[PDB]
Design a protein around this ligand. Structure first.
Ligand SMILES: NCc1ccc(C(F)(F)F)cc1
Length: 330
């Protein structure tokens, strides 16, 4: 079997992407943020504290004939920004773009952090990292992808994120019309539960390629590109007037500047991020200072190839027994 679903940016900056997901019987459609950096499927629900819900569509297990309470199971997650949520667990039928999994763990939020409440367009997260990171206790649960793996034609999913435009998540097949050239595959380490890989180097604009190993994770759930301080300094040094700002929390640049492209290596292949993808607009309404899409990972502890990088490529998440990541130009 296969599935295919359109994913849509939530705002004009591509801060995140939402994908419609059908939960329950009859279907309740929620717009979820597909996150290859986490492994929980959690949703706003009828159980969420009413004061913490502002315009989200909620999952109502009592209206689903296939929902079953997973007795005694709880979950609690905290993300890399101090985002957190927690609650109890149901099992229910979950379908993505025609692909159906029965008995999927659906984690119902009783409390969510304020950053989720203020984001009316995201009804929950669908985690696509490895199941070892799932937070359900005492019995850890499988991700949607792990549950679907057996039924899939091929144990893969692909991410084709658009620049200021809709894109596609496909499950079980590789659309050979969606990319150009060849797909370059690279080894994945699962030791931390992430889609972790090693980039072979980088270039700034038309500069010479610097061969150097950058270990990082492919994370559709993170907006920006977070790289070591040395790399990020070399990039912003080519932008007249750019500086690292303590009060803003990262590199900013004059909105009038034109940004150079950024190239990262995948084996012997090169993926080019156009400079326009790195512009995240004014730091505040009316400001002439703009926020950069490439930032330092020094405070995070891990390098993150977020949406800024991934949307420049067609990306294959190969969940075979030896997992690999594939990158192609598009
Ligand atoms: N998109 C989920 C996510 C968020 C933050 C982190 C890290 F890097 F902070 F641990 C990993 C994964």
């Amino acid at each position: 079997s296969t599935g295919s679903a359109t994913t849509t940016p939530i705002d004009s900056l591509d801060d995140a992407y939402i994908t419609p997901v059908q939960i329950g019987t009859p279907a309740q459609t929620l717009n979820l943020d597909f996150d290859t950096g986490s492994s929980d499927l959690w949703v706003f629900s009828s159980e969420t504290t009413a004061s913490e819900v502002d315009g989200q569509t909620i999952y109502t297990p009592s209206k689903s004939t296939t929902a079953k309470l997973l007795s005694g199971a709880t979950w609690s997650i905290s993300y890399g920004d101090g985002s957190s949520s927690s609650g109890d667990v149901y099992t229910d039928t979950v379908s993505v773009g025609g692909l159906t999994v029965t008995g999927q763990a659906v984690e119902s939020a009783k409390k969510v952090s304020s950053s989720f409440t203020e984001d009316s367009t995201i009804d929950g997260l669908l985690g696509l990292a490895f199941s070892t990171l799932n937070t359900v206790s005492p019995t850890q649960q499988k991700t949607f992808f792990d549950n679907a793996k057996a039924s899939l034609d091929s144990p893969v999913f692909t991410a084709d994120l658009g620049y200021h435009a809709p894109g596609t998540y496909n499950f079980g097949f590789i659309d050979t019309t969606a990319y150009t050239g060849s797909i370059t595959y690279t080894a994945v380490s699962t030791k931390q539960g992430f889609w972790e890989w090693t980039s072979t180097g980088y270039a700034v604009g038309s500069g010479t390629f610097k061969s150097t190993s950058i270990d990082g994770i492919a994370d559709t759930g993170t907006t920006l590109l977070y790289l070591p301080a040395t790399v990020v300094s070399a990039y912003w040094a080519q932008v007249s007037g750019a500086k690292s700002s303590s009060s803003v929390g990262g590199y900013v640049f004059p909105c009038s500047a034109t940004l150079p492209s950024f190239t990262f290596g995948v084996g012997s292949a090169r993926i080019v991020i156009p400079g326009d993808y790195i512009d995240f607009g004014p730091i505040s309404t009316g400001s002439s200072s703009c926020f950069g899409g490439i930032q330092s990972s020094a405070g995070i502890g891990i390098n993150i190839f977020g949406d800024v990088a991934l949307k420049a490529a067609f990306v294959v998440f190969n969940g075979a027994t030896t997992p690999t990541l594939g990158f192609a130009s598009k």
